[PDB]
Design a protein around this ligand. Structure first.
Ligand code: CL
Ligand code: ZN
Ligand code: ZN
Length: 237
């Protein structure tokens, strides 16, 4: 059974109970929902003759449906997935990736925290230099994916990804959009270092003009400065 895409008034395409949006010739945003209802975004990148995934959906079934979409619309093997912190929205579908033979990667800290956060750890751990950049030996054949740990923010373990050859960087749950009224789920957050991490993210990917994030539509760099400003407000109490 194929699924046909259900095009929307916004140009997203519905496929099952997921939404897919093309951001650039070789980059798509994937969106899944949990019940109110709550959107979570990740990315799919075509890199020559393989596909790379950033984040799962909330569930194994939704993540399986992402894999079906890739099979049906791109038709290339998924070489690896990178997940950006240890919460359900980002790591809730690991078993589906593992069932499909996909090699998975996460911050070593994300893997250490996963059992406590109710998550399945990834198979491989990314480690980071003191300047925040991924150690290249721990992220082999990541193609255009540039992984950067900006410091504690939304969580202690949150990491971020830039896409070489595009103007796209993925803030994950660290960044919120330019109209956001708060910083959201602050249960696991570092209120002291959040602002510095958000600015570190901006400095790490200075040529990114499209900032993709977990919980709203892509936004400009205004999301970065807006998030930092809200993070400062908070730190001063
Ligand atoms: Cl599940
Ligand atoms: Zn989170
Ligand atoms: Zn989240």
């Amino acid at each position: 059974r194929p699924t046909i895409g259900q095009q929307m008034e916004t140009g997203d395409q519905r496929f099952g109970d997921l939404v897919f949006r093309q951001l650039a010739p070789n980059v798509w945003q994937h969106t899944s929902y949990l019940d109110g209802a709550v959107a979570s975004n990740g990315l799919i990148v075509r890199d020559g003759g393989r596909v790379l995934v950033v984040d799962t959906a909330w569930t194994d079934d939704q993540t399986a449906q992402i894999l079906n979409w890739i099979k049906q619309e791109i038709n290339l093997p998924v070489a690896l997935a990178v997940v950006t912190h240890a919460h359900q929205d980002k790591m809730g579908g690991m078993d589906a990736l593992h069932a499909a033979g996909i090699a998975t990667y996460a911050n070593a800290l994300s893997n250490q925290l996963a059992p406590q956060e109710g998550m399945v750890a990834a198979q491989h751990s990314l480690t980071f230099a003191a300047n925040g950049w991924v150690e290249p030996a721990t992220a082999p054949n990541f193609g255009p994916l540039k992984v950067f740990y900006p410091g504690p923010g939304h969580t202690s373990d949150n990491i971020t990804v830039g896409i070489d050859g595009t103007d796209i960087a993925f803030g994950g749950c660290l960044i919120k959009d330019s109209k956001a009224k708060s910083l959201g789920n602050l249960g696991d957050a570092d209120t002291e270092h959040y602002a510095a991490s958000a600015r570190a993210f901006g400095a790490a990917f200075p040529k990114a003009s499209m900032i993709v994030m977990s919980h709203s539509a892509p936004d400009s760099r205004a999301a970065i400065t807006h998030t930092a400003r809200m993070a400062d407000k908070l730190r001063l109490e």
